[PDB]
A paper describes a structure:
Enzyme activity of Sco GlgE1-V279S decreased by 32% at 100 µM concentration of 8, but 7 failed to exhibit any inhibition of Sco GlgE1-V279S. Although 7 failed to inhibit the activity of Sco GlgE1-V279S in the reaction conditions described here, we thought to examine any interactions formed between 7 and the enzyme that may inform future drug design by identifying interactions between enzyme and ligand that destabilize the Sco GlgE1-V279S/7 complex. The location of the chloride ion overlaps significantly with that of negatively charged phosphate and phosphonate moieties in previous GlgE1-V279S crystal structures. In the Sco GlgE1-V279S/7 complex, the interactions are similar to those observed in the substrate-bound (M1P and maltose) and substrate-mimic (MCP) complexes because the saturated carbocycle in 7 maintains the expected chair conformation. Specifically, the C(2)–OH and C(3)–OH functional groups form a bidentate hydrogen-bonded interaction with Asp 480, which is a unique feature to the GH13 family of proteins and has been observed previously in GlgE. An unexpected difference between the Sco GlgE1-V279S/7 complex structure and other complexes of disaccharide-like compounds is the rotation of the Asp 394 side chain away from the substrate analog. Due to this bond rotation, Asp 394 in Sco GlgE1-V279S shifts away from the substrate binding site and does not form any direct interaction with 7. While this structural change in Asp 394 is exhibited unambiguously by the 2FO − FC composite omit map density contoured at 1.5σ, the reason for this movement of Asp 394 appears to derive from steric hindrance with atom C(1) of 7 apparently due to the attraction between the C(1) ammonium moiety and the Glu 423 side chain. However, the very short distance between those atoms can be rationalized if either of the two side chains becomes protonated and the O(D1) atoms in those residues are using that hydrogen in a low barrier hydrogen bond.
Mtb GlgE is a genetically validated anti-TB target as the absence of Mtb GlgE leads to cytosolic accumulation of toxic levels of M1P by a self-amplifying feedback response leading to cell death. Previously, we have shown that hydroxypyrrolidines modified with an α-configured − 2 site sugar can inhibit Mtb GlgE (Ki = 237 ± 27 µM) as well Sco GlgE1-V279S (Ki = 102 ± 7 µM), a closely related homolog from Streptomyces coelicolor (Sco) GlgE1 that has been mutated to be 100% identical to the M1P binding site of Mtb GlgE, and affords much higher quality X-ray diffraction data.
Author numbering:
A (entry chain A), B (entry chain B): 15 to 663
The structure:
């Protein structure tokens, strides 16, 4: 038995960990399956992709083509359907009809071996007819056979009879494939559309209170949901909603001593009042949480809860399960760290004394919130807990509940970041906030939209409570507008943390990425109604971008993305396509100066020939332009951060 | 079960076809095994390579190191011993001693938790000592334990006792490894040294005749073997030695009709006199061939026979096994082609009517020559026969006779070139003859000495009967000298085709790579005595290069190779190392003009600091130089093609 088959089919992609983990897609998402295919000699090969659903049923006939001359690399686009575990193979074969037609078109006009070449075609078409089940289809091919053999007909007419549309139609439904050779199946995990596509909004329920009761409840925070839904978001991500420890509770601005009424960090989970399966008493009860989830769902909002596998020194686990922590020789537990940052208010979990008990308890907690309608979890710093722990936990949960989505907040080195995605995390936080120049954005999105897309789905949060980038600090509102346009149009999943739309951008100090007076350590009442009346919010732009995404399928996918050259380093241009929908975006990355540039479009990447016009509508303004292969743009910060255009068909 | 283990070990290399085929090595060859290794959290990891012989016996402790900062890619060099099928794994582990030392070096001077830090250190070193055999080593560690616990000494003194060179020494030999996690084994096929290392000489026995009998016999051709052994060659490659067909025999200069005296192409195998298992009657008998083999072996020469799976129209196969050929409807068999080459004198083989019969006959023919002492086969155009056919044939032969070496003469597209090596060909011809500029040579050898070396062993023939490159045509003798130095020092296997040493460089016509009056179609007597006496041969340079290779282990391997920058595009520089042996080569690629340049050596790549001097001997002349990080060279074509230096002491 040989490893290589009769017609070699080699190195099928996408592949993840040599086939030990599945490649990823979502329902309705297209992607390319590729392979190295060739044969000995110079006759033509053909190849096709066989995509099989969870019941083993094959998809449509999906022929591949050589992707670049002389490379022997072949590809075809497939489209994922219903959720579940699929598989794909590549089949390769000798293509005798293509081979013969190429020879006949050369030899017959020159009168070379005319009778022999035509007879080769005749018995070939007889061979193709042998497998054709329909009487009328066979009669079609046999008619071409008889014409090819008709020596009382001019040679050019004998040949032409083999090349009619009616003949092609029979062979398109019953191609003659010789020496068919197949790869061994590769796995594909197809998940729900929200795993790839959605707009996220993060806020702290406790900040949405009243003057008499400053600490918000789930009942008072629910009245923020209409604004979030009106802004076009799909997912509401809440920081931890559990009781918060008192021992070593942090004060305002990340100080080490809480005083008086200080509320502490929600990530310092646990007290005698309860742990990860309980509600902070100041937020209300489990019934109040159910009300919040119900009202969110009525507005089309899904809840994502924070899952932080750690605890305050007051969490019941500390004395119930000491073996879930690392102890020093005096029995004390060192506080958690993530250098240069220190988390003096929490203990990290240790995994090597009782990994089974920890897995059991983790999936118990997840299933509790899942029973209360939470089908999405934002997992904190997963890279400080074992990779195989997450692989086990995610397999357990998705085994019974495949719709649950896990988002990995792993800002770390690339190997870890990729591996967490590959072992099951549906979504990943990314380096987006630290990619701000044209070359940074072009290189990083080229990576994310390329091979990484077979295992990672990016969530572009333009800010988080822990990341206020210097680009926003120094650029002000025009910079918030730019980063919103970029996040919303470069990834099918993007997000903001509350206050982004108010352009809050005061750092803790120069050179920090923390917010001054951070909401992680204090209630932050915001007068949303006043900000809207004073026009100091970019909620309208955010709303518009989410509507554009909902109206243009090209923005609801990741992999089809092309950057078009401009002649100014501050002006970036790119297009995305899905079916007949094309979106073309031009962004001025300079938040301080107007920028003029010529955008030179790669017309064929738009499906257009070089002389065609490009009728576009700028969805930010409603204006129409008659663009072509080279277009002058002028973008003024504070007025026109970008053009977000749909190509008119 | 999870795919990822406790400590992630991912993407172990070398790997061939995802582990379905073995990686390659030869006895005594060192190569790098690498992996992606990291863990959760901030603590240190270590890793090591476990190489196991065919009996499962493990090699020595082989610790790995991170290859570049922040990449999580680790590697170590291993060395293959005896031939057979080996395996290797990577083990990764938590490194608690490195972790503790890092924290102690910070916290002790800071005065943070110093009692706890020192006691954790004492318990850790006690754990490390538990596994140390040898009273001396275990006692050394336990003495550090007791010093760490000695509260009558200052904290800094207690720590310092854990960090002494004598303590490091024990830990380097008995490292304390936690959470040890293994990759799954990967296969390694270790073959005899000649598969990687050897000098090859090709000649036509029939050209080595006498004044009275111009068609050489095996007995007259045996008289050429002493001169071949004297230039330091190890392998003699003969074109086909079988009867030659008469139907469509080619005449001189690749003309289509032979006259009565014309000898034809040796590749047009077969006649009523016999096929692939017979001797051309003008060469003599099988007993004469045995004499030739015996004489070669006495001179230290191995024979490689040409194996051409094809035949003339007169071969016995044509009537005995018609199903081994594709017949057109009129019964004709189209002559072979390798476009744009046409081979009107031969039929190609067809593989799908009787694959078992062809495989049986192929291995029968090989075993016949194998029984007569031929253990190396040069396989013509293997890419025009099925890849899986060669996989089957090579596995059959090497299953009973693992010493047999197959060389693939596949000048074709890269995918096929790579796949043939991967399915078992011990050696491959390469693009060497079409890589002549500095950029071409540097890029191509970086490829061959990199990942490709896990599955392909290059044989650098500087010419063949089918390839007289324009570089040699235009450059004359100084170009022959340059290509000899390059071939002999950049690959552990190189070769020339007879007449190269005479600088034969007249092409068939401008733009051709054929020789005028090619030896493929006519006897080519050469006056070896005259050329030697008149000094118009570069045989002494060839001899010196083979002696240098025999004296310098760095030149008997492939993968250790580094290119050093020069300031002249015509001057290339590179070094190779094997243990303490370092060879440094500087070549002037210009065959017409003297070139002077500064070679700026990457000193750490030579194991030297930037300021040191390196004493070198130019092995081509015996002159000694004192070189450093920057060295002036002046190379005069005709006088000096190159410096081929060894580093002294
Ligand atoms: N990256 C994740 C996990 C981090 C650890 O919880 C969390 O850090 C917050 O919570 C800590 C514990 O309460 C505080 O010590 C800390 O100062 C504060 O910033 C991040 O906000 C969150 O995004
Ligand atoms: N590449 C391999 C195989 C080739 C095909 O056999 C062989 O071609 C030679 O032999 C043919 C058959 O006799 C001739 O028609 C041809 O003109 C001549 O060049 C090559 O020399 C050899 O290196
Ligand atoms: Cl953080
Ligand atoms: Cl050839």
């Amino acid at each position: 038995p040989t490893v290589v088959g009769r017609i070699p089919v080699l190195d099928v992609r996408p592949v993840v960990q040599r086939g030990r983990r599945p490649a990823k897609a979502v329902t309705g998402e297209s992607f390319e399956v590729s392979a190295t295919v060739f044969r000995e000699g110079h006759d033509a090969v053909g190849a096709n992709v066989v995509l099989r659903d969870p019941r083993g049923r094959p998809g449509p006939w999906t022929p591949m083509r050589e992707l670049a001359p002389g490379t022997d690399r072949w590809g075809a686009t497939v489209t994922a359907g219903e959720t579940g575990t699929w598989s794909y193979t590549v089949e390769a074969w000798g293509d005798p009809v293509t081979t013969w037609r190429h020879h006949a078109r050369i030899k017959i006009p020159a009168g070379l071996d005319t009778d022999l070449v035509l007879e080769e075609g005749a018995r070939l078409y007889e061979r193709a007819a042998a497998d054709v089940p329909g009487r009328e289809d066979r009669r079609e091919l046999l008619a071409a056979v008889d014409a090819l053999r008709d020596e009382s007909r001019p040679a050019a007419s004998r040949l032409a009879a083999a090349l009619t549309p009616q003949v092609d139609a029979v062979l398109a439904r019953h191609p003659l494939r010789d020496l068919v050779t197949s790869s061994d199946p590769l796995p594909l995990l197809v998940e729900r559309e929200r795993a790839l596509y959605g707009a996220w909004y993060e806020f702290f329920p406790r900040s949405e209170g009243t003057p008499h009761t400053p600490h918000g409840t789930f009942r008072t925070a629910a009245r923020r949901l209409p604004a979030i839904a009106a802004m076009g978001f799909d997912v509401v991500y809440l920081p931890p909603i559990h009781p918060i420890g008192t021992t070593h509770r942090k004060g305002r601005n990340n100080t080490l001593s809480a005083t008086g009424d200080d509320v502490g960090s929600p990530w310092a989970i646990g007290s005698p009042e309860g742990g990860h399966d309980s509600i902070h008493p100041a937020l209300g009860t489990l019934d109040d949480f159910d009300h919040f989830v119900t009202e969110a769902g009525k507005l089309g909002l899904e809840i994502a809860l924070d899952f932080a596998l750690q605890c305050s020194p007051d969490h019941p686990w500390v004395h119930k399960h000491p073996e879930w922590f690392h102890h020093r020789p005096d029995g004390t537990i060192a506080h958690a760290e993530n250098p240069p940052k220190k988390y003096q208010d929490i203990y990290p979990i240790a995994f090597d004394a009782d990994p089974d008990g920890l897995a059991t308890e983790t999936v118990r907690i997840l299933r509790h919130w899942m029973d209360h309608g939470v089908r999405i979890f934002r997992v904190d710093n997963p890279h400080t807990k074992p990779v195989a722990f997450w692989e086990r936990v995610i397999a357990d949960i998705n085994g019974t509940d495949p719709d649950v989505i896990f988002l990995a907040e792993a800002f770390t080195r690339p190997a870890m970041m990729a591996t967490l995605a590959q072992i099951g995390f549906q979504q990943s936080y990314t380096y987006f906030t630290w990619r701000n120049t044209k070359q940074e954005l072009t290189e990083y999105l080229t990576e994310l939209s390329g091979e990484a897309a077979s295992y990672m789905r990016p969530n572009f949060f333009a800010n988080t409570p822990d990341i206020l980038h210097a680009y926003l600090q120094h650029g002000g509102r025009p910079a918030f507008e730019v980063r919103a346009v970029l996040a919303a149009t470069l990834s099918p999943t993007w997000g903001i943390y509350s206050g982004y739309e108010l352009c809050e951008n005061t750092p803790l100090r120069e050179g920090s990425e923390e917010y001054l007076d951070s909401e992680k350590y204090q209630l932050k009442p915001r007068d949303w109604t006043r900000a809207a009346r004073e026009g100091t919010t970019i909620a309208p732009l955010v709303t518009r971008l989410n509507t554009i995404r909902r109206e243009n399928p090209a923005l609801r996918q990741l992999r089809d993305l092309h950057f078009h050259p401009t002649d100014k380093e501050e002006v970036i241009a790119y297009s995305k396509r899905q079916g007949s929908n094309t979106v073309l975006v031009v962004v001025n990355l300079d938040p301080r100066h107007t920028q003029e540039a010529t955008v030179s479009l790669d017309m064929p990447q738009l499906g257009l020939d070089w002389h065609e016009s490009v009728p576009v509508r700028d969805e930010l303004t409603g204006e129409t332009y008659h663009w072509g292969r080279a277009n002058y743009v002028r973008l003024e910060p504070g007025r026109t951060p970008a053009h977000v255009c749909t190509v008119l068909r």
